[PDB]
Amino acid sequence: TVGAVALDLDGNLAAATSTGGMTNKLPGRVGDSPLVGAGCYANNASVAVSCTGTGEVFIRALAAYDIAALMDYGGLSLAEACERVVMEKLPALGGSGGLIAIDHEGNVALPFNTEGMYRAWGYAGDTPTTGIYRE
Amino acid sequence: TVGAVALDLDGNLAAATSTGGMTNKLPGRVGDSPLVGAGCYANNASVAVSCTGTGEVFIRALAAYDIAALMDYGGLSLAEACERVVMEKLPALGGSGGLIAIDHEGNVALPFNTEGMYRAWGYAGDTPTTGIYRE
Amino acid sequence: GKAVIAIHGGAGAISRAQMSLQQELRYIEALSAIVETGQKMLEAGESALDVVTEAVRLLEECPLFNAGIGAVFTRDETHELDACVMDGNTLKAGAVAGVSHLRNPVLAARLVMEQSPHVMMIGEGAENFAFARGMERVSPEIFSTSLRYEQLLAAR
Amino acid sequence: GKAVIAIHGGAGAISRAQMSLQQELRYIEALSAIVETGQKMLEAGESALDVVTEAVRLLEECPLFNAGIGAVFTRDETHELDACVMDGNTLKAGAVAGVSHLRNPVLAARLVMEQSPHVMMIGEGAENFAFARGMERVSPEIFSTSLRYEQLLAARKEGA
Numbered sequence: 154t155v156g157a158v159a160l161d162l163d164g165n166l167a168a169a170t171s172t173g174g175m176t177n178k179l180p181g182r183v184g185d186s187p188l189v190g191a192g193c194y195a196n197n198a199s200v201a202v203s204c205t206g207t208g209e210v211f212i213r214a215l216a217a218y219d220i221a222a223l224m225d226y227g228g229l230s231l232a233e234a235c236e237r238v239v240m241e242k243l244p245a246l247g248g249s250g251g252l253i254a255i256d257h258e259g260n261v262a263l264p265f266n267t268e269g270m271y272r273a274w275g276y277a278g279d280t281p282t283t284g285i286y287r288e
Numbered sequence: 289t290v291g292a293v294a295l296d297l298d299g300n301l302a303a304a305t306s307t308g309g310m311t312n313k314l315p316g317r318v319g320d321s322p323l324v325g326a327g328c329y330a331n332n333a334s335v336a337v338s339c340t341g342t343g344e345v346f347i348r349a350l351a352a353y354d355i356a357a358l359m360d361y362g363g364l365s366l367a368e369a370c371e372r373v374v375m376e377k378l379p380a381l382g383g384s385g386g387l388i389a390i391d392h393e394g395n396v397a398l399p400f401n402t403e404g405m406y407r408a409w410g411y412a413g414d415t416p417t418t419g420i421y422r423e
Numbered sequence: 424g425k426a427v428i429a430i431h432g433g434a435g436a437i438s439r440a441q442m443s444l445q446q447e448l449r450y451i452e453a454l455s456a457i458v459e460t461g462q463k464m465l466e467a468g469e470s471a472l473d474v475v476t477e478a479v480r481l482l483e484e485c486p487l488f489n490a491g492i493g494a495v496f497t498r499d500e501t502h503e504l505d506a507c508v509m510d511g512n513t514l515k516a517g518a519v520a521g522v523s524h525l526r527n528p529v530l531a532a533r534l535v536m537e538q539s540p541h542v543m544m545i546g547e548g549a550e551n552f553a554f555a556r557g558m559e560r561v562s563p564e565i566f567s568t569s570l571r572y573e574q575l576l577a578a579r
Numbered sequence: 580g581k582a583v584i585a586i587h588g589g590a591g592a593i594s595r596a597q598m599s600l601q602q603e604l605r606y607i608e609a610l611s612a613i614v615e616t617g618q619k620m621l622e623a624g625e626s627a628l629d630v631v632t633e634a635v636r637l638l639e640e641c642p643l644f645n646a647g648i649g650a651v652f653t654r655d656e657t658h659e660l661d662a663c664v665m666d667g668n669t670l671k672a673g674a675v676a677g678v679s680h681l682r683n684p685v686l687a688a689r690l691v692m693e694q695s696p697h698v699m700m701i702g703e704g705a706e707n708f709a710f711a712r713g714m715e716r717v718s719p720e721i722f723s724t725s726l727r728y729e730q731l732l733a734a735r736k737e738g739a
C-alpha cells in the first residue's frame with residue numbers, strides 16, 4: 154500500500170491511497186484502502202489521512218475518519234489523535250500498521266506501530282525527510 | 289435498501305443493511321450500504337445504526353460512524369447526534385434519506401429528512417409501531 | 424434487560440400522491456410481521472446479531488423492498504446486491520457487494536464475518552467463497568419484479 | 580499553514596537486520612524523488628488533489644511498492660487492485676476496488692470522482708467505466724514481480 158496527503162497553497166487538503174492488498178488474500182477481498190474513512194479521508198476543516206497495515210482492523214476501527222473525529226469532537230491535536238489511534242486503539246484490536254496525516258494548520262504526523270514504514274515528507278520550498286525505521 | 293438494528297437482553301448491539309442499490313446505477317457502483325461506518329455500524333460503547341438514502345453522500349459524511357463519534361467523543365445524546373447528521377450535515381452536502389439507530393441504553397431514533405421512510409420498532413414484550421410518512 | 428429492535432425498508436422511494444392505500448397497507452403488514460419476529464426472538468434470548476440477520480433476511484425475501492427479491496435494476500437491466508452486518512460486542516463485521524448469484528446477501532455477509540479472515544468481499548470472489556461454504560447459487564432472474572422494472576423505465 | 584506533502588510506501592515487518600544499505604537506499608531514493616516532485620508541484624501552485632494523485636501514481640509505477648506495478652498476489656496468483664482519492668475542499672471522493680486491467684488505480688479513482696455521479700466502483704464495472712474515459716486495458720501480468728511472488732510463496736510456506 155502507498156499513499157499521499159497534502160496541504161496546498163490555497164489551504165486545501167487531499168488524500169490518496171493505492172494498493173494490491175494483502176499477500177495471499179482471497180480473490181474478491183477488499184481492504185481499507187479504497188474505503189472512505191477507513192484507509193483514506195480528507196476534509197479541509199480537519200485532516201487528510203492515508204493508512205497502511207492490517208486492513209480488516211482499519212475498516213472495523215474506521216481509522217482515517219477516527220483521526221478526524223478525535224480532533225473534531227474529542228478535542229485532540231493531530232499528534233494526540235494519531236497516538237491514540239495507531240499506538241493504542243489499533244493494536245488493542247489486533248491491527249498493526251500506520252498512517253500519514255496532515256491537518257488544516259499544516260501539522261504533519263507519520264505514526265506507525267510496526268518495525269518500519271516507508272515514508273517521506275516535506276514543506277514546499279524545503280528539503281524533504283525520508284525514513285524506513287522507527288525514531 | 290433495508291436494515292435492522294437491535295439491542296439484546298445481554299446488552300449487545302448489532303446492525304445489518306442490504307440493498308439492490310439505486311435504480312439505473314452504472315454496473316459496478318457501490319453505495320453506502322455495505323460500507324462499515326457509512327451505511328452500517330455497531331459498537332456496544334455507543335450505537336447501532338443502519339442507513340438509507342442517497343448513498344454517495346452517506347459515504348462522504350461517514351454517516352453511521354459520525355452518529356457514534358458525536359455520542360462517544362462529543363457527549364451528545366442519540367437524538368442530538370441524529371438531528372445534527374440527518375437534519376443538518378447530510379442536507380448541506382446534497383444528501384437525503386434517514387437512518388435507524390439504537391444506543392447502548394436502549395434509546396431508539398428513526399430520523400429522516402425525506403417525505404417518508406418505511407420503518408418499524410418495538411421493545412421486546414411490547415407492541416410494535418410502524419410508519420411510512422412523517423410521524 | 425431493555426431489549427429492542429428497529430427496522431427500515433428505505434427512505435426517499437416514497438410519495439403519497441403516487442401510492443395507493445392497498446400498497447401502504449401491504450408495507451405496514453410486512454414491517455409489522457418482521458419487527459414482531461425480531462421482538463419475539465429478542466424476548467426468547469436470541470442475540471442482537473442473529474436478530475438483525477434474520478430481520479434483514481426477511482426484508483430481502485419480501486419483494487416489496489429493494490434488497491434481495493425485489494432489488495432495483497442497474498442501467499443494464501441486471502441486479503447487483505450489497506449487504507453488511509456488524510457485531511457491537513467484538514466490532515466484527517462482514518460485507519459483500521456486487522453479488523448477483525446469492526439469494527440472501529446478508530447471509531453471505533455473515534459468512535464473510537464468521538468464516539473468513541476478511542471483512543469485505545465483492546463479485547465473483549464473494550460468490551465463490553460463499554459457494555465453497557455451502558451457500559447455493561441462484562440465477563439473478565429470481566430478484567426481478569415488474570415494480571422495479573417499471574421504475575427503471577421511469578428513470579429513463 | 581505552510582504547504583506540505585507526506586507520502587508512504589507501506590508499513591510492516593521491514594527488518595533492519597535482514598536489509599543491506601544498498602537495498603535501503605533504493606527505497607530512500609524512490610521516496611525522496613517522489614516527495615520532491617510533490618513539493619515542487621506544491622510550490623508551483625498545483626492543487627493538493629493533483630499532488631496526491633501524482634505522488635500515488637509514481638508510487639504505483641515504482642515496482643518497489645505494493646500498488647500498481649509491484650502489487651502483491653492473491654491466493655490464486657493474480658492481482659486485484661484498490662485505490663481511493665478524496666478532495667477536502669468539496670468532500671468529493673472516488674474509489675475503485677478489485678480492478679485487474681487498469682494500470683493506475685489512483686487515476687481510475689480520480690475518474691470516478693470527477694466524471695461520475697458515484698464515489699465507488701468495483702470490478703469489471705469500474706474497468707469498463709475507466710476504459711470509456713481513456714484508460715487502456717492492460718494485462719494483470721504487468722504488475723507481477725519476482726519480489727512479491729517470492730513473498731507469496733514464503734507466506735504459503737509459513738501457512739504449511
Ligand SMILES: N[C@@H](CC(=O)O)C(=O)O
Pocket residue numbers: 154172173174175183184185186204205206207208209250589590
Ligand atoms: N492496508 C492494506 C494492506 C497494507 O497496507 O499492507 C490492505 O488491507 O489492503
Ligand SMILES: N[C@@H](CC(=O)O)C(=O)O
Pocket residue numbers: 224225227228229230
Ligand atoms: N477542539 C476544542 C477542544 C480542545 O481542543 O481541547 C477546541 O479546540 O476548542
Ligand SMILES: N[C@@H](CC(=O)O)C(=O)O
Pocket residue numbers: 224228229230231
Ligand atoms: N485542534 C488542535 C489545535 C487547537 O485546538 O487549537 C488541538 O486541539 O490541539
Ligand SMILES: N[C@@H](CC(=O)O)C(=O)O
Pocket residue numbers: 289307308309310318319320321339340341342343344433434435
Ligand atoms: N443508500 C442506498 C440506496 C437507498 O437506500 O435507497 C444506496 O445508496 O445504495
Ligand SMILES: N[C@@H](CC(=O)O)C(=O)O
Pocket residue numbers: 681682683713714715
Ligand atoms: N494513459 C496511459 C496509461 C493508461 O491509459 O492506463 C496510456 O494510454 O498509455
Ligand SMILES: [Ca+2]
Pocket residue numbers: 162163
Ligand atoms: Ca489563492
Ligand SMILES: [Ca+2]
Pocket residue numbers: 228229230
Ligand atoms: Ca485540544
Ligand SMILES: [Ca+2]
Pocket residue numbers: 224228229230
Ligand atoms: Ca482542538
Ligand SMILES: [Ca+2]
Pocket residue numbers: 161163624625626
Ligand atoms: Ca489551487
Ligand SMILES: [Ca+2]
Pocket residue numbers: 715
Ligand atoms: Ca500505453
Ligand SMILES: [Cl-]
Pocket residue numbers: 444445
Ligand atoms: Cl383501499
Ligand code: NA
Pocket residue numbers: 482483484485486487488489490491492493494
Ligand atoms: Na426484498
Ligand code: NA
Pocket residue numbers: 638639640641642643644645646647648649650
Ligand atoms: Na508500485
